[PDB]
């Protein structure tokens, strides 16, 4: 199957060329929505934290997969190990509402308090990347406040992602990178 | 696209491109890629109160240098730019007297040479481009891209929508759009091809649209 | 055997702010009849619609015409922090949500005497710029003149023309400029007008709209 | 009616979740800010 | 839609559970997958 | 064979062929050469008390070098070799637990070099080829050939059927096929051609049957 | 199916609580044990 290679345009033989037959598939598991759909731990440094979705790990499933896109959108729903009253703030608030508790204010039940969440920006949708580097103040999900915040997760729920960015494996040092993996106690 | 006479030992697939009183015609095209859609979204936002408006004028052609590929620059060698730059005429005028604006890219890039030459690059057009890092140069092309190959083509053409997490934006301190071109096979230049490639870019802003007359001295 | 129930974790704590509602104990209590009591209002946004309230320049709701020609009587912030709103119910009311979008309108109301004319002009100075400060500069922006008459008061509607779909009614410390751009409303001339009050005031637009309620504030 | 959104009804009567009004005999500045004025009063051209 | 698989619908009314779309006015590279040429381009012998 | 675009500068006349797993493809055919025939006679003979098979794995591409071309070698300068020669793999396999069998070739021989070169090629099978005179390289034509001529093809193609006469042979001593191929015009380099030129063959043996298994230590 | 007997169906859905099975194209000892001679393969009297 030769191609004017330039062309750009997208090419996808077969093993039928050759006599093969190709077969069925459930890429169920390489769905945008479903895949992000998960928690991903975010390391909280203070007592109150801005909710950000860039803070993933880069090289963690979410956070590596969120950043494969330039734009996004998606509601979030967060798990926090805390201590005393949770509050939650809507994005653009002053700072200074964390401290109000007539805002969104969780009491506690440990260990983790689990909550919904509206996208709250005012954009129609945010990015991973931005050439106008360092992300824009109203790139965020609100703000929260606990007396104490010992962990924080959060998932994205309703993902839709918007051009693709690339996504890097480990560079092998060797032919291929042979590692560990999960087998049975020898005996 | 394709010319007739025949087959011949010259070249063929003819195509002209046309913005506003310009255009450009091209004896070697391998087509145009499309980018990622086939039209923009809604041009008139809430976010604008219905004040926007469309000038006609500012969709035309204007040429603008890249750089000169030698057989020295070899693998990963890039060139990138911000669309607009410099811009002047009608649509740099525009940019002067509206708070904010959008527009998309009608982008032909032409690295003139001869059939004798080997080497290739790879031309494409990405969203918030920020700094590859070395090893994602070898997945660029996961944006609007097309490559130029001596052997095959002289021109290089892409077409792009206007994209941006806001329905406008204030180009003064914004640009989606970032042009690049690579080097993937270094040049070539064996007995009779050229010395060295001359990089041009032809390029159209498309669907413009302003919002938001700014004040004025002059 | 009985029903089997999961207690998940991380459900059921508190909330200010959950769409429940708690469990009675004292039932069966029948209120007075309130049918018709005059003046009740539905949602905030109507009186802010119906009632603008005034604009402040040090103290005062009016602007005075200094002398005759082209004087700029006023310029400021698109903000609902903005000095000048501050007694603006408009403001008072923007406090408590974080977002907004929508048209705001100016009203101008001429005080002078029978034997007092002036002719006014007002724009809205989109951000990018610096606020002019003459009218012939002005007069590229989208702007209004009008002359006094019968009719004591103008209306006008101030676009809300922004990148985002969104704006804040609040107003970052990192912004130097009013994010919004301003307003400028100038004098091209008068007669026998000068000292005299052109007080303003400003009300909730038709498309005004004020979202994501937040309490900011001291207690 | 204000922040509730609980798709199933109160388990509880609602004589004793609430309190019952009596009548005897839509509102207002909804009305007002309706009424009012958006022409123009003059007369336009172009 | 995402990785969720109650049976039961939310008991919470979906203004509430979730932020409500507007819209203005299937997708990409979906499409673009899909219009890829598969065949062979030549003249086929045997 | 043809191609499309239009015309062009460089090759078109595509075609690809196909054995078994085994495909190959070629932007300068020239068509492809019959035998002595479309069809070969009955497989299933009396002489066979029709225990004959007919295996499909066999018939496969398998490759094997000829020569190189060098503009030393003048006219008549010619290459010759009796299929199947020393057989490697499944077809090899065949011979060495069948006593009797039978196959045809489809024969793809491949002198890559470059359209600057001058020169040409004959390439023939021959049928009980045993020593042909020098005069009689000018009558070579009567058997099924296909000439390579830089200028125009790179590859010649033949298909060609089982002869003999016998119905089935025991081909570890007699063959009736023996590929030829021949300078007619010595090979000319100019200033751009290519300096010498390598000489392949893509080989297929065509419908094959065996019969009469043999006895086995290994 | 096996030592499960709760009346109510799941409150999950049955793609998250179990792994799906395919197929591409009753069992065995179950016939094998059935397909058992029982007779007398003699010839009986009285």
Redesign the interface.
């Known amino acids: 199957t030769t191609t004017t290679g330039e062309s750009a345009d997208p090419v996808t033989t077969t093993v039928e060329n050759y006599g093969g037959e190709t077969q069925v598939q459930r890429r169920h598991h390489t769905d945008v929505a479903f895949v992000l759909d998960r928690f991903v731990k975010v390391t909280v440094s203070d007592n109150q934290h801005t909710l950000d979705v860039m803070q993933a790990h880069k090289d963690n499933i979410v956070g590596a997969l969120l950043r494969a896109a330039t734009y996004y959108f998606s509601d979030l729903e967060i798990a926090v190990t805390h201590t005393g009253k949770l509050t939650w703030v809507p994005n653009g608030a002053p700072v200074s509402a964390l401290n109000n508790t007539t805002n969104p204010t969780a009491y506690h039940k440990g260990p983790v308090t689990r909550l919904a969440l509206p996208y709250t920006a005012p954009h129609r949708v945010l990015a991973t990347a931005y050439t106008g580097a360092h992300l824009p103040t109203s790139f965020n999900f609100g703000a929260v406040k606990a007396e104490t915040i010992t962990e924080l997760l959060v998932r994205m729920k309703r993902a839709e992602l918007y051009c693709p960015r690339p996504i890097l494996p480990i560079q092998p040092t060797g032919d291929r990178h042979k590692q560990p993996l999960v087998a049975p106690a020898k005996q | 696209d394709k010319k007739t006479e025949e087959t011949t030992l010259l070249e063929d697939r003819i195509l002209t491109t046309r913005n506003g009183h310009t255009t450009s015609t091209t004896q070697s095209s391998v087509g145009v890629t499309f980018g990622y859609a086939t039209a923009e979204d809604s041009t008139s936002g809430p976010n604008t109160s219905a004040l926007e408006t469309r000038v006609h004028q500012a969709e035309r052609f204007f040429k603008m240098a890249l750089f000169d590929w030698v057989p020295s620059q070899n693998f990963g060698h890039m060139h990138k730019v911000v669309l607009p730059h410099e811009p002047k005429g009608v649509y740099g005028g525009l940019v002067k007297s509206y708070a904010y604006m959008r527009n998309g890219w009608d982008v032909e890039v032409t690295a003139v040479g001869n059939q004798f030459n080997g080497g290739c690059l790879l031309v494409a057009l990405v969203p918030e481009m920020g700094d590859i890092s070395d090893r994602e140069k070898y997945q660029l092309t996961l944006y609007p891209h097309q490559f130029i190959n001596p052997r095959t083509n002289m021109t290089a053409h892409i077409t792009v929508p206007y994209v941006g997490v806001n329905r406008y934006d204030q180009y003064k301190q914004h640009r989606p759009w970032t042009l690049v071109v690579m080097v993937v096979a270094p040049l070539t230049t064996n007995t009779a091809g050229a010395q060295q490639i001359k990089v041009y870019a032809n390029i159209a802003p498309t669907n413009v649209h302003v919002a938001g007359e700014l004040p004025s001295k002059e | 055997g009985i029903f ?1 129930v999961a207690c998940s ?9 959950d ?3 708690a ?2 104990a004292y ?10 009591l ?6 905030y946004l ?2 802010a ?2 009632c603008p309230t005034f604009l402040m320049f040090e103290n005062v709701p009016y602007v005075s015409t200094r002398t005759d020609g082209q004087r700029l009587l006023a310029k400021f912030d698109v903000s609902l922090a903005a000095k000048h709103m501050s007694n603006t119910y408009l403001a008072g009311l923007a406090q408590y949500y ?2 907004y ?1 929508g ?1 705001i309108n100016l009203h101008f109301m001429f005080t002078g005497p029978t034997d007092a004319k002036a002719r006014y002009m007002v ?1 809205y ?5 610096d ?2 400060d003459n009218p012939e ?2 007069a ?3 702007h209004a003149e009008w002359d006094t008459g019968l ?1 004591s008061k103008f209306t006008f509607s101030i ?10 009614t ?1 107003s ?1 410390e ?1 912004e130097t400029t009013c994010v919004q ?1 301003w307003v400028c409303v100038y004098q091209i001339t008068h007669g026998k007008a000068d000292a005299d009050a052109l007080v303003v005031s400003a009300s909730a637009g ?2 005004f709209e004020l979202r ?1 309620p ?4 001291q ?1 | 009616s204000g922040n509730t959104g609980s798709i199933i009804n109160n388990y509880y009567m609602q004589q004793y979740q609430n309190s019952m009004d009596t009548q005897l005999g839509n509102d207002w500045f909804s009305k007002l800010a309706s009424s009012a004025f958006s022409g123009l009063f003059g007369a336009l051209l172009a």
């Open positions: 089997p974790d991380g459900y059921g704590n508190m909330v200010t702010t769409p429940k509602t469990d009675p039932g069966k209590v029948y209120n007075p009849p309130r049918t018709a005059p003046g009740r209002f539905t949602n109507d009186v619609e119906a974080t977002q979008t048209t724009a100075v989109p951000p990018g710029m606020a002019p500069e002005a590229h922006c989208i009719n676009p809300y023309i922004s990148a985002a779909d969104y704006t804040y609040a970052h990192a751009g038709k498309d994501l937040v309490d900011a504030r207690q």
